Design a protein around this ligand. Structure first.
Ligand SMILES: CC(C)=CCn1nc(-c2ccc(O)cc2O)c2cccc(C(F)(F)F)c21
Ligand SMILES: CC(C)=CCn1nc(-c2ccc(O)cc2O)c2cccc(C(F)(F)F)c21
Lengths: 233, 10, 239, 10
């Protein structure tokens, strides 16, 4: 009874591409953040505005609409940080060694290593970006990956499974379209999906640090961010 | 009641 | 080396033979046991399993090709993930229960905390494998994937060479998983879908591990549940 | 050094 499963591969790709949220900007102040207050201030600000675009993007992901409101809330609560991060590493691809949080906000590990901030997570994101770049990740593949994260991350907590299969078909469709052999297709599929385990890892680590930021209570957090963080505690 | 609940309705 | 030259069936046989034994807990029904008692059983058990895991790891095709420092890192990152998937595997035929050991079969009820959420995630995961009819051959491939993949992005140069070798081995294991599914009479589409399904599970196992490591840290701070020197060092690396 | 390191190299 879900329309998602009736879509074709190209239809799914188009739906997802049309769903893509815009790339948002940070403040136009040109000072490069080296403190935690300043940097974390910019990240919370950015994440807040992105969460609104993400919420409306999610509703345009095929199959998501068919879920109960409660299931939608759960999936978003589970996957919001993963979705932001994979977006980050995506737009950071063409800037090796740097993290493009926004077009006007390009950070390096010297700002990251700069308290706390966290350099470990910073480095993880960079490695992920570099890997996406070396794989020559395509935009169409990226959108499929991001939607998988949305539907899968909170799944454990048939529709979702059947929808996830459709997205799998769509990824293979894209790879076949790119001229990849059968072996290259399933190898690239595995490579991409295994990246999701690390994205999960970074999200969990990031959530622990966001939680710390909350407790330190310096750097106020929006109600939405605290509720998204609460869901994890 | 959470904000997500509201925003997901819009 | 050997890992790259191995056929699919050779890879499977090698992994199946490298399988660690199923250890017993020290659970005793005649004893009271708190709920830090159950955790004591599980940490004690995990500690003993770790020696056998280290053994199993060195027999994972391509693992020995790595430097001791890389092998150490991979195990520090993946040990809890590996124990958990092992748990879920042997718990398949026990719906609603987790078989930590042949003499330690638990349902979600028995105190714990609210740890229960991790318990339920393990139950759900195990439930997933059951409906997919996960095969032992597939399982051993998945477990070796965890080992080689979990810490691969948190290890410079020539250290880059180690990474590439790991990616190749992973690629080979992917080829092996497909080989198995094809053997099972699955259509290409069904092979790709099953492959994805299996790999997505690993995301949740990573999640369960992460949550587990947090509780583990808690147990250390509380200082009631005994943790082996090895478990503490393992926990040390993660933090 | 590390126990894990010791257990591995033998
Ligand atoms: C320098 C590092 C590794 C910080 C981790 N991080 N990255 C983002 C983020 C914000 C917007 C976006 O579009 C994509 C993102 O990944 C983010 C948002 C809230 C908390 C944290 C944390 F984990 F620092 F608390 C975050
Ligand atoms: C009650 C629950 C589900 C706790 C999670 N958990 N499960 C195992 C474990 C031990 C042996 C084995 O063969 C397989 C396992 O998953 C384990 C080992 C150390 C710490 C924890 C911690 F801190 F997460 F509780 C562990």
């Amino acid at each position: 009874n879900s329309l998602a499963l009736s879509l074709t591969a190209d239809q799914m790709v188009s739906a997802l591409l049309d769903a893509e949220p815009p790339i948002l900007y940070s403040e136009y102040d040109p000072t490069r953040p080296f403190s935690e207050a300043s940097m974390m201030g910019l990240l919370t600000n950015l994440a807040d505005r992105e969460l609104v675009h993400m919420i409306n993007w999610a509703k345009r992901v095929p199959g998501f609409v068919d879920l109960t409101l409660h299931d939608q809330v759960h999936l978003l609560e589970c996957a919001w940080l993963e979705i932001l991060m994979i977006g980050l590493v995506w737009r950071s691809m063409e800037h090796p060694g740097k993290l493009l949080f926004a077009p006007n906000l390009l950070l390096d590990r010297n700002q990251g290593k700069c308290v706390e901030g966290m350099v470990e997570i910073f480095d993880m994101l960079l490695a992920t970006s570099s890997r996406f770049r070396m794989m020559n990740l395509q935009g169409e593949e990226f959108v499929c990956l991001k939607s998988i994260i949305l539907l899968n991350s909170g799944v454990y907590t048939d529709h979702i499974h059947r929808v996830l299969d459709k997205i799998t078909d769509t990824l293979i469709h894209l790879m076949a379209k790119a001229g990849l052999t059968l072996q290259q297709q399933h190898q690239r599929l595995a490579q991409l999906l295994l990246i999701l385990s690390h994205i999960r890892h970074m999200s969990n680590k990031g959530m622990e640090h966001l939680y710390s930021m909350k407790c330190k209570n310096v750097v106020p957090l929006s109600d939405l961010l605290l509720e998204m963080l609460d869901a994890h505690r | 009641h959470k904000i997500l609940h509201r925003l997901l309705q819009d």
